[PDB]
Design a protein around this nucleic acid. Structure first.
Length: 315
DNA sequence: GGATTACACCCAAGACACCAGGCACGAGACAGCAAAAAACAACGAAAACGGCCAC
């Protein structure tokens, strides 16, 4: 189980079934873990492990036989060929159960790799799994019917191996335009040597679409002095240059006076600096004048500690 | 019988090819102030964030 539910997983054991003994894979539940191993198979009933902690004591875990196997992680297995398979699929037990309602999110290769852990391959090998129906599903008449049967065969083959069970919502998508300073920086980066250099193969496209998203968030994020002016230059953020501040200012102020607890969502902690300078400036403007209320934001990320979590989640 | 009549035997001029060496090509192989100094372009990038374990 993840490290965010470690105590939780021991808790239901304690409350529902006290007769079941339990031992987490930590300093308690290099010799000390070996005395822990002493009578962890006869006396010990259930062993708990964080899915980072197996490769801390795997020397004396993967060796002996095991019974029932539970893994509460269906998005940290995904596709094959990773440390996942290295420390997981070497377990010695038919009983293999995964607890996750989102196993399929990227591709059917993840499906094959997840089916491998539970069953020894009722479908076939990875080359077999691919050559069977990988391309036909993607491309697809000339595809549908043969593809229809080749897919329903898979559905009947794996269906008795994974269970499936399922106010209102408004999805308004606004299509804003690139500003003129944005279009200039877009064309400048558009016609440059680095893009072709990435395309031919010396680099990866992952570093050329991260920088063209770096300009869409706002112009001032493709600067070389990003860290040098992120939190010590009160002009780094700015407004109306991003092409989205106006549909941010208007949309957030339509709820600020309306009193609607709203969620602002990003992906980068670097753009958090800009949206945080922006909202501090909004706070300054509101506080200087009257008939208003402080914006009162907060930012949470991996920089903070695991202890904080729920607290802010609650506040 | 023995010498004219004929035919064999060889040897000398002859030729073609042989043996080698020249002669020309043929392309490698060069190989081209020294000392001093300054300008002077080009040699030339893994993003970013999280979930951890160990501080």
């Amino acid at each position: 189980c993840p490290a965010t539910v470690l105590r939780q997983w021991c808790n239901e054991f304690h409350r529902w079934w006290p007769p079941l003994r339990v031992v987490i894979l930590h300093a308690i539940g290099e010799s000390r873990v070996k005395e822990l191993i002493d009578s962890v198979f006869t006396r010990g009933h259930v062993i708990i492990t964080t899915y980072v902690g197996l490769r801390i004591y795997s020397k004396h875990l993967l060796k002996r036989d095991w019974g029932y196997a539970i893994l509460d992680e269906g998005h940290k297995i995904r596709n094959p060929n990773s440390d996942i398979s290295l420390t997981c699929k070497q377990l010695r037990t038919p009983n293999r159960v995964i607890l996750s309602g989102t196993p399929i999110q990227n591709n059917l290769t993840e499906l094959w790799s997840l089916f491998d852990f539970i069953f020894p391959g009722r479908l076939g090998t990875l080359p077999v799994f691919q050559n069977q129906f990988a391309i036909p599903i993607n491309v697809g008449n000339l595809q549908v019917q043969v593809g229809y049967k080749c897919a329903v065969t898979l559905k009947d083959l794996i269906s008795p191996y994974l269970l499936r069970r399922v106010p209102k919502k408004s999805e308004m998508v606004l299509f804003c335009k690139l500003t003129a300073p944005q279009h200039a920086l877009y064309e400048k980066f558009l016609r440059s040597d680095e893009l072709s250099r990435i395309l031919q193969g010396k680099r990866q496209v992952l570093y050329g679409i991260d920088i063209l998203r770096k300009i869409c968030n706002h112009p001032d994020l493709v600067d070389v002095h990003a860290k040098r002016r992120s939190k010590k230059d009160p002009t780094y953020g700015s407004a109306s240059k991003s092409g989205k501040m106006q549909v941010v200012k208007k949309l957030l102020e339509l709820w600020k006076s309306q009193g609607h607890k709203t969620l602002l969502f990003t992906q980068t902690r670097q753009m958090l600096d800009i949206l945080e300078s922006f909202l501090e400036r909004l706070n300054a403007k509101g506080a200087e004048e009257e008939d208003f209320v402080p914006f009162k934001f907060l930012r949470m990320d991996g920089t903070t500690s695991i202890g904080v979590r729920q607290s802010l989640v609650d506040v």
